[PDB]
């Protein structure tokens, strides 16, 4: 009986490949041959945030592009002022082994999680004037890998249970369960319209999810190793992926297939973090070789190198206005990068 | 401008002072990782040192010996896959690995798990502590002779007792040959890779053994001393 179902499923896989091939007219690299190259980009460290004890694993940027939150494995969450470097809040986490952190769009809530399997939520704008644990979410049997905020009452959660879930802040229960991944889900990114989101798993595949329906729409299996980082294009029609096989891939929703791949011969180490710029022309990917590389999102050539970290970069973030880029690595140091005339 | 920024500067100074105060207690405590299979007696070990020395995710056990704080974390209810979340444990003082030597069936899996941990790129910096649990069960079953070890490890029939093997005051020499052969098997994997970056400390441990806390404290002290000497470029 199982043989019949497996044979039926095998045939359907060929149909997807044929449909994807039928639309493959030309590579994106071919059509971009007439565009002007970006050229070498010089980036210098404008601000250096230090004070964390253990290695920094994740960070996020605020909507106002003024404050950012960073997570370190010492059990401390610190909110940094990018302009004047003062620390506005220090949150002593209940669990030291934290792997992710999120910043609410309204700036009133901050969430974090890790190996504790609990999504701790902290309220900043409190009537008393002190940070406290607002709500703690439990139900995941695996480690907490990533989380993002849709609004003040809804939060998207990614864990190692090969499943994602949408949580209600007030109810504290899973509104929907996102099932279909086979490996541990590493990270997810929300579209600008906060309508659809995609998440990468440890199975060399990516899936398109819908928060309203809770069912898969598109699947991309272009990568060869486990996908570590993922980020949405600012236009909402594409998204890039980073994996351990030292290559970066850009996928488009309408095309349902890859456009090109970013790779180079001296790079033998995978990518940990990846994000786009405001215009989307620059693709910044944090590699494991103690520095970050900037890739052209149309020409796929190297635009620059963000060196200065003694250890692997674990997180990368670009502000909503593209004014600066801040990178966090395992040396407990945060480097903010900006251009010059 | 400066009037409003004064409060921010004072708050930042207070946060820095709190961070500096917490840094001392953070660095005073030593972090440890506990790894092992289901058959290994990790539960017995943690029960023994949590009583004598004072969905859920990972667990935490805090014990103090010789006025030194130690923290150890267990895997907990995590999934079987561990290649992804084990990289964050690369800053712990050492890993306590528990192996059941009285079964001869899951021993090969224990060897493979130890080899992967030892050869891991992120875990190659920090040392691993080896505990060979359930020695009494190993001694009893090898004395009975119903279950053999040569069938699972044919190299045992030609293996000889090391000259430096110091046994207990009284026990059958067959037990000594069996336990040291397993130890020699583990140290072969440990010495197969690593040019002095990390070391392995084999120790014989029983379920009711109350000296586990002392052995961990001595092993942690040796690792700290060796790391300091490495920083001095003396070793």
């Amino acid at each position: 009986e199982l043989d019949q179902l497996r044979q039926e499923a095998e045939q359907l896989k060929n149909q997807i490949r044929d449909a994807r091939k039928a639309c493959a007219d030309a590579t994106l690299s071919q059509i971009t041959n007439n565009i002007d190259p970006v050229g070498r980009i010089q980036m210098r460290t404008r601000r250096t945030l230090r004070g964390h004890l253990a290695k920094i694993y994740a960070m996020h940027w605020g909507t106002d592009s003024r404050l950012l939150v960073s997570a370190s494995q010492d059990g401390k969450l610190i909110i940094w002022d990018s302009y004047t470097t003062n620390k506005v809040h220090a949150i002593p986490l209940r669990s030291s082994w934290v792997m992710t952190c999120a910043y609410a769009p309204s700036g009133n809530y901050v969430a974090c999680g890790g190996l504790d399997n609990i999504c701790s939520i902290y309220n900043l704008k409190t009537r008393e004037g002190n940070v406290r644990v607002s709500r703690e979410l439990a139900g995941h049997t695996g480690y907490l890998s990533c989380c993002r905020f849709l609004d003040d009452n809804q939060i998207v959660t990614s864990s190692g249970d090969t499943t994602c879930a949408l949580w209600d802040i007030e109810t504290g229960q899973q509104t929907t369960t996102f099932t279909g991944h086979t490996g541990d889900v590493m990270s997810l990114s929300l579209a600008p319209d906060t309508r659809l989101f995609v998440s990468g798993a440890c199975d060399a595949s990516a899936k398109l999810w819908d928060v309203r329906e809770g069912m898969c729409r598109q699947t991309f299996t272009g990568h060869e190793s486990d996908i570590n980082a993922i980020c949405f294009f600012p236009n909402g029609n594409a998204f890039a992926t980073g994996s351990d096989d030292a290559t970066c891939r850009l996928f488009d929703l309408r095309a349902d297939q890859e456009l090109m791949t970013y790779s180079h011969d001296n790079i033998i180490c995978g990518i940990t973090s990846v994000s786009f710029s405001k215009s989307g022309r620059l693709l910044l990917a944090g590699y494991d070789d103690f520095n970050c590389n900037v890739w052209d999102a149309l020409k796929a050539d190297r635009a620059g190198v963000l060196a200065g970290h003694d250890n692997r970069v674990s997180c990368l973030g670009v502000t909503d206005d593209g004014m600066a880029v801040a990178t966090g690595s395992w040396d407990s140091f945060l480097k903010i990068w900006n251009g010059s005339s | 401008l400066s009037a409003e920024d004064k409060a921010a500067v004072e708050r930042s100074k207070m946060i820095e002072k709190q961070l500096q105060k917490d840094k001392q207690v953070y660095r005073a405590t030593h972090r440890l990782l506990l790894l092992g299979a289901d058959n290994s007696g990790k539960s017995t070990i943690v029960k023994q040192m949590r009583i004598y020395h004072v969905t859920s995710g990972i667990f935490e056990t805090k014990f103090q010996v010789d006025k030194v704080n130690f923290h150890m974390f267990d895997v907990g209810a995590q999934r079987d896959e561990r290649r992804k979340w084990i990289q964050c444990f690369n800053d712990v003082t050492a890993i306590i690995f528990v192996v059941d030597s009285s079964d001869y069936n899951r021993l090969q899996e224990a060897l493979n798990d130890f080899k992967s941990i030892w050869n891991n790129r992120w875990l190659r910096t920090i040392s691993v502590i080896l505990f060979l649990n359930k020695q009494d069960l190993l001694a009893e079953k090898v004395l009975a002779g119903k279950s053999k070890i040569e069938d699972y490890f044919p190299e045992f029939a030609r293996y000889t007792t090391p000259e430096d093997a110091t046994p207990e005051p009284g026990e059958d020499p067959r037990v000594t040959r069996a336990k040291y052969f397993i130890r020699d098997e583990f140290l072969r994997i440990s010495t197969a890779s690593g040019d002095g970056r990390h070391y392995c400390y084999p120790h014989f441990t029983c379920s009711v053994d109350t000296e586990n806390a002392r052995r961990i404290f001595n092993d942690c002290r040796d690792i700290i001393q060796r790391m300091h000497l490495r920083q001095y470029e003396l070793l």
Partner: nanobody
Amino acid sequence: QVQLQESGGGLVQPGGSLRLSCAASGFTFSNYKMNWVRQAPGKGLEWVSDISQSGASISYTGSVKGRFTISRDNAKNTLYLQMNSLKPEDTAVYYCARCPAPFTRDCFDVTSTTYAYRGQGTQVTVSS
């Protein structure tokens, strides 16, 4: 898409010989280390043998030490494992598993219950 498919098996008299084959695709086979796993009926997955990227380093399990020979051919994109001197305790479903990341010297989740880089396996039965 990364996929693996093993071949070879069936009913073999005890003491016979076999030669499993699997054709890797969707990734650079020369840059990934490969392992072999069998699952006995009623028993968990256990490591069998492995071979390095270039084949310079080869290791075997004690129960299969010297019995079996494992080799890879990067040109033909195919992995091989010679099985001779079979005994009826060797009946198991043999799976071919890959390592998570390329250019690595550590291969962790091969023996895990669920793995995304292993083939469907082939039935190998040794009965008289």
